[PDB]
Design a protein around this ligand. Structure first.
Ligand SMILES: O=P(O)(O)OC[C@@H]1CC[C@@H](O)O1
Ligand SMILES: [Mn+2]
Ligand SMILES: [Mn+2]
Ligand SMILES: [Mn+2]
Length: 391
């Protein structure tokens, strides 16, 4: 192999400007990093800059350099949707025609009617909400009626909450599996169904660790499947294992924040493995993008950038670092949904002794998967063009 270990970092939702098909999505004018840079009166990301971020696009406080550490370009999304699952599935070599849906005004009556009809239970709520808000509002009614609290969020999720002393946990999991089957339907395609059992009394409800997620498997065998099947290490950090429903994952490392995600990246740099270490930094999307909080988003990006020099110091000659994103989520955009954007691509190895150059624009995110596959000599994915030879 040209590289013994590839470290792939997805900065979740960190877009680099509206994509060519942004109009279809109502995303004209969107620009995640650019709007954040403007809000911050200049972003301080000196390490991403040294890698060549500004060489991709100059933005406030983000300038090009004469000799970037590695290679740089951006990527265009080919799949129909702009959600996290679509983006990650494309990265690992797939093409996804059918988008996952988001539900800002709740779920269609048709879907909820069929769920009631199958479960023998009434449904209440049906709106985007955090776990705490919805329980305060509807927990007592749930307890008294044996109802199900069905709710959503800014991402493609259907969440079902029930008190553990009113609806048995095993019954809640059965209900969620029914909902998982019903939501495999393009009219109401949700990324994930989530059991949200809770306990306590009115004015003091607590969600329990008995939460269970019901994810869909990627629509195809990914490069991660192929890596795993050829006995390579595939170390998933953060939401990565969940995003792929465990497909192709050999070890999974849970994280609780972006700084924790960088600590686990460092842990994998200290492991003797051959194959892929794959980090998702999710705070960008989950805490700041959807909440339309450009200040918190800007601070998070600066906090992330300050961690990078330790990553640089630990990379070996036969290590490759890849930094990218899976869509945009512009924190100064209308509504609460993602935005259809190009995503940056930075490719760095210490063996690049004369620095890098511009790569041709990646026409699908799957060029990442093709590059990984070619590096490790596994079956090339159906989609994507490797840039391994350009490095
Ligand atoms: O605890 P919360 O605010 O209800 O977060 C729920 C998450 C947010 C998006 C989806 O992952 O579900
Ligand atoms: Mn929009
Ligand atoms: Mn995402
Ligand atoms: Mn999101």
């Amino acid at each position: 192999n040209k590289y013994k270990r590839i470290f792939l970092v997805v900065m979740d939702s960190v877009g680099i400007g509206e994509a060519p098909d942004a109009e279809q999505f109502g995303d004209l004018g969107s620009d995640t990093i650019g709007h954040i840079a403007e809000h911050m009166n200049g972003l301080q990301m000196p390490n991403m800059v040294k890698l060549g971020l500004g060489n991709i696009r100059e933005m406030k406080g983000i300038s090009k350099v004469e000799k970037p550490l590695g290679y740089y370009t951006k990527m265009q999304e080919k799949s129909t949707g702009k959600d996290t699952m679509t983006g990650h599935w494309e990265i690992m070599g797939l093409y996804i025609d059918t988008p996952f849906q988001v539900f800002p005004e709740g779920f269609p009556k048709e879907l909820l009617d069929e769920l009631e009809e199958k479960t023998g239970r009434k449904i209440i709520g049906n709106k985007p909400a955090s776990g705490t808000e919805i329980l305060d509002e509807l927990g007592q009614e749930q307890m008294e009626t044996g109802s199900l609290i069905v709710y959503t969020a800014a991402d493609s999720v259907l969440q079902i909450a029930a008190h553990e002393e009113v609806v048995p946990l095993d019954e809640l999991y059965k209900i969620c599996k029914i909902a998982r089957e019903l939501t495999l339907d393009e009219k109401y395609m949700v990324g994930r169904v989530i059991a949200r059992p809770f306990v306590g009394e009115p004015g003091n409800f607590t969600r329990t660790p008995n939460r269970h997620d019901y994810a869909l498997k990627p629509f195809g065998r990914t490069v991660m499947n192929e890596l795993k099947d050829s006995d390579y290490d595939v170390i998933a950090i953060g939401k990565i294992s969940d995003i792929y429903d465990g497909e192709g994952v050999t070890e999974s490392l849970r994280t609780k924040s972006n700084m924790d995600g960088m600590d686990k990246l460092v842990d994998t740099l200290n492991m003797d493995f051959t194959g892929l270490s794959f980090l998702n930094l999710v705070d960008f999307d989950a805490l700041f993008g959807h909440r339309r909080d450009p200040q918190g988003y800007g601070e998070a990006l600066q906090e992330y950038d300050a961690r990078l020099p330790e990553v640089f110091a630990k990379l070996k000659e036969d290590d490759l670092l890849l930094i990218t994103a899976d869509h945009g989520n512009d924190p100064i955009h209308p509504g609460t949904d993602h935005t259809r954007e190009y995503v940056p691509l930075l490719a760095y190895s210490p063996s690049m002794k004369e620095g890098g150059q511009e790569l041709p624009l990646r026409q699908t995110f799957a060029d990442i998967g093709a590059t990984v596959a070619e590096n490790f000599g596994v079956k090339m994915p159906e989609y994507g063009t490797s840039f391994l030879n350009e490095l």
